[PDB]
């Protein structure tokens, strides 16, 4: 019911399995993974690219339960960002004025 699969390995798995067309290890040897994120919908509309992950956050991070509480995706969006400010081994890189004409995702370098 309330287990702790751990986000670090949860991502190492999703990234290795390549469940989202864009999220994946750019350099798995040094553990570098990049996700596309919902750069399009900053709230809740064009946010289906990473919604399967973002939505799983509520169940994977043990925060929302289907049948007992309300499935609010608005907070799930913020939950995703908290993970980026966590695990003292992740380096987020979304570019600033160069790679901004194709996708502009968030490349995260994860240490061991």
From Swiss-Prot:
Post-translational modification: Acetylated by CBP/ p300 during cell-growth. Acetylation on Lys-74 is required for stimulation of H4 promoter activity.
Induction notes from the record: By viruses and IFN.
Modified sites of kind N6-acetyllysine: 74, 77
DNA-binding region: 4-112
Location in or out of the cell: Nucleus
Function comment: Specifically binds to the upstream regulatory region of type I IFN and IFN-inducible MHC class I genes (the interferon consensus sequence (ICS)) and represses those genes. Also acts as an activator for several genes including H4 and IL7. Constitutively binds to the ISRE promoter to activate IL7. Involved in cell cycle regulation through binding the site II (HiNF-M) promoter region of H4 and activating transcription during cell growth. Antagonizes IRF1 transcriptional activation.
Subunit-structure text: Interacts with BRD7, IRF2BP1 and IRF2BP2. Interacts with CREBBP in growing cells; the interaction acetylates IRF2 and regulates IRF2-dependent H4 promoter activity.
Family: Belongs to the IRF family.
Name of the featured protein: Interferon regulatory factor 2
Organism, as annotated: Mus musculus
Lineage: Eukaryota, Metazoa, Chordata, Craniata, Vertebrata
Gene name of this polypeptide: Irf2
Residues of the full protein shown: 2 to 113 of 349
């Amino acid at each position: 019911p309330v287990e702790r699969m751990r986000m670090r390995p949860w991502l190492e798995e999703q990234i290795n399995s390549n469940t989202i067309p864009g999220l994946k290890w750019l350099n798995k040897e040094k553990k570098i993974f990049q996700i596309p994120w919902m750069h399009a919908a900053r709230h809740g509309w064009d946010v289906e690219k990473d919604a399967p992950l973002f939505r799983n956050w509520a169940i994977h991070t043990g925060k929302h339960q289907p049948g007992i509480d309300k499935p609010d995706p608005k907070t799930w969006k913020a939950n995703f960002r908290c993970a980026m400010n966590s695990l003292p081994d992740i380096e987020e890189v979304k570019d600033r004025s160069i790679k901004k004409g194709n996708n502009a995702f968030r490349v995260y370098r994860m240490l061991p």
